[PDB]
Amino acid sequence: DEVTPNHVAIIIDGHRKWAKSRGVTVQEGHQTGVNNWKHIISRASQLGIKLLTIWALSPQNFNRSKMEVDFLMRIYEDFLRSDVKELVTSQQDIQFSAIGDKSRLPEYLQDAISYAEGLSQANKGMHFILAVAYGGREDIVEAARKIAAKVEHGILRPDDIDEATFEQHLMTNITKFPSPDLLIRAAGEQRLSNFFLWQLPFTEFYFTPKLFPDFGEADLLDALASYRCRYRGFGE
Amino acid sequence: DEVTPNHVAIIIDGHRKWAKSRGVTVQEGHQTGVNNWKHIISRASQLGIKLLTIWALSPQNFNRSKMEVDFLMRIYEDFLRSDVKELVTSQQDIQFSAIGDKSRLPEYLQDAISYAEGLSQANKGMHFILAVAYGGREDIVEAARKIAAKVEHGILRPDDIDEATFEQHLMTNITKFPSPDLLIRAAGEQRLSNFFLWQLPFTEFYFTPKLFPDFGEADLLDALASYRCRYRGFGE
Ligand SMILES: C=C(C)CCSP(=O)(O)OP(=O)(O)O
Ligand SMILES: C=C(C)CCSP(=O)(O)OP(=O)(O)O
Ligand SMILES: [Mg+2]
Ligand SMILES: [Mg+2]
Prior knowledge:
The structure is a homodimer. Chain A is an alpha/beta fold. Chain A has a single domain, classed as Decaprenyl diphosphate synthase-like (Undecaprenyl pyrophosphate synthetase, 3-Layer(aba) Sandwich), CATH 3.40.1180. Helices cover 43% and strands 13% of the residues of chain A. The first copy, chain A, is built from eight helices and six strands. Chain A has a six-stranded parallel sheet with strand order 3-4-2-1-5-6. The structure holds 3-methylbut-3-enylsulfanyl(phosphonooxy)phosphinic acid (2 copies) and magnesium ion (MG) (2 copies). It is classed as transferase. Keywords: substrate binding, prenyltransferase, substrate, transferase. The assembly is dimeric. The entry is titled "Crystal structure of lavandulyl diphosphate synthase from Lavandula x intermedia in complex with dimethylallyl diphosphate".
């Protein structure tokens, strides 16, 4: 229904603050966060959103402690193995993709991604992108490299490079809705932290102080209601 | 002083809402807005900010009425002819540059830019960038084209393309602070509207409901105070 975004993206944050707050391990913060994802993806599907992207891991995040990063990777494998398998085989019929530098991930996580993508390859329901080892600068540079390789091999001239060409070489080339209509960021910070950059020229931003382990279906609804109250003029 | 941003950027907005609100012409809205710029640039200089960017005109804005756009162009000529001439010849010793697709502008505005840039070429004070006919997508594509031309002529291989190389071909290559530390947007909308994109992976965003004709030195101070209260973790 028109006032329903095609693409919603979410930046998860606030997991350690939440753990600190509740006297509990950061790992428990992360696990309680990841447990919210399935209800959010269900909700977005019911609402008629066409693509939901959840950003789970930036390149910068690899500079955290080894054990924190390894626990995240394991939780994501588990998420892809249970929750995602349930979503793509439900009547929601979700299509699953992962975007990012998947070569940086543990082989097991790469395999779990392959499995979930293969299992959902023919599905026709809402697309769900898990962005993992995904950074917006890195996307742009890698697009630039792919375009330059084509120029090197004669397939493309420099003056042929336009928005649309640049767009077809990003990691979001797997969707016809690469640009989010609505970007949600949990935990109160007002910054992109090297998420999408090319993708965001007209995206509506919604920032909630809610820490992501507390973030549920009602918080998605709240962001959507803010969205419907926005006037989008696109410069003109 | 450390907690002072090197680069502050401002998105001006809310001029027609302000005019509507006060029963006055949109053109008067725009002129009252542009009259605020000099006190903002002075203030940023006093505060030890190293670069202040004011975004005045996007490519999208060219889809407004002819007369609105022509009035903006004339006001900008006048700003560059009086206010900017005063700033660069004051003891603030401001260095003036314009960024954007300057070929799309009226020759007279192009000449006014040339004059102010030439007059300030040797200055050592705060840099002031006026971004005019500047769009973030357009920046990235034009960088991509310049890099591809170099690849075509053998100066660069595709695997040589890294962040830093990509950065030296954007329109912000004129500063050593291309990425704003703090981005201010007046008038209550929470979106970039095709301003900087590459430039913004870690920029702090500050959104004020104040309509830009009401925006003064205290509103800069308020954004700076919010800035100093932000915790910046850069992913790690
Ligand atoms: C081009 C600028 C100086 C500011 C961008 S705000 P503008 O009104 O042009 O664009 P939208 O609010 O997205 O409609
Ligand atoms: C990588 C994400 C899933 C979210 C970005 S929030 P993160 O805490 O990683 O980064 P900062 O707040 O800028 O320190
Ligand atoms: Mg965080
Ligand atoms: Mg506006």
